[PDB]
Amino acid sequence: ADILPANYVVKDRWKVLKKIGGGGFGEIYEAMDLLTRENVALKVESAQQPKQVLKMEVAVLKKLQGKDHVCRFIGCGRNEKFNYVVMQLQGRNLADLRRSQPRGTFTLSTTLRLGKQILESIEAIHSVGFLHRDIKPSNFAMGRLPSTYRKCYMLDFGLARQYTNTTGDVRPPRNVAGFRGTVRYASVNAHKNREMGRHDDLWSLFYMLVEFAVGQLPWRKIKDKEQVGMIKEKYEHRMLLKHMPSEFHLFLDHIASLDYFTKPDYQLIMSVFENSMKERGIAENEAFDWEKA
Ligand SMILES: CC(C)(O)C#Cc1ccc2[nH]c3c(c2c1)-c1nc(N)ncc1CCC3
């Protein structure tokens, strides 16, 4: 029931090696580029699929070309059986890398430097008029080249939504919007089925970095969406920072001040990470936790 069988060739050029990801809305393959001779990521959507989402993912990926933390766009197309996009192949995701660490915790020096890169990628997608709406560790992957192995890449625009109109204006929010993303790193706004904003992507970043540094979130054992929302709604969030750098209280306070309409202060949040590093003498050139160094 896979859309492409192994050794299937797309457009006489990309040869399927194996499936590397799957879900309701399509599949991702590692393929060999019979022209450039590197391997690539080949993401496919069944032609017959009711909700056609790939066309928007490709539009977002093309808008982001030239930005750091973005896969290179190789090709796309359309035929009677499937839509596809070919993109740069990336490596290990941050969820797998976090689980591989002894206590499921990154050093502050890894956490803060990933934070800078993820924040850059969030501002980037926001700058072309889209919300990601499923910011989570498994959607960020480290590079797999000498030129990219300390670079973090933003994946999966499958749940993204344009928050501007044709003419650059902020769109009206729907009075109710069904939150369809991952429970653990969802904002209290998303839990309430409110229209998501730029601030909700930065809430997801906040929860990710607490989990990175501390090794857990208070609700991690609870999978039910409506229970997790009720736990978050009451949780004293300044408790989450007990063992985090104090400069995180600026980040929390800022994103708590934001609504759907307000452009976030990305530079305020960047300065939290940069001041946290400077305080501790963390350098940018440091080993990540998962490297031999
Ligand atoms: C078109 C766009 C940007 O929206 C997308 C997307 C995308 C969704 C789901 C995915 N699952 C995986 C990947 C992936 C990508 C993946 N992608 C890449 N390029 N390298 C490596 C991997 C790791 C293997 C698993």
Residue numbers in the entry: 21 to 313
The authors write:
Their kinase domains have 88% identity, 96% similarity, and the same catalytic residues: lysine 63 and aspartic acid 164 (TTBK1) and lysine 50 and aspartic acid 141 (TTBK2). We have described the design, synthesis, and biological evaluation of a series of indolyl pyrimidinamines as chemical tools to interrogate the functions of TTBK1/2.
Our lead (AMG28) emerged from examination of the off-target activity of a published Amgen NF-κB inducing kinase (NIK) inhibitor. The potency of AMG28 was reported in the MRC Kinase Profiling Inhibitor Database as 8% activity remaining for TTBK1 and 12% activity remaining for TTBK2 when screened at 1 μM. Biogen evaluated AMG28 in a biochemical assay (TTBK1 IC50 = 199 nM) and a cellular assay that measures inhibition of tau phosphorylation at Ser422 (IC50 = 1.85 μM). The aminopyrimidine ring makes two key hydrogen bonds with TTBK1 backbone hinge residues Q108 and Q110. All inhibitors, including AMG28, that protrude into the back pocket produce remarkably higher Tm shift values than TTBK inhibitors that are unable to access the back pocket, including those built upon the AZ2 scaffold (ΔTm < 3.5), when tested in parallel.
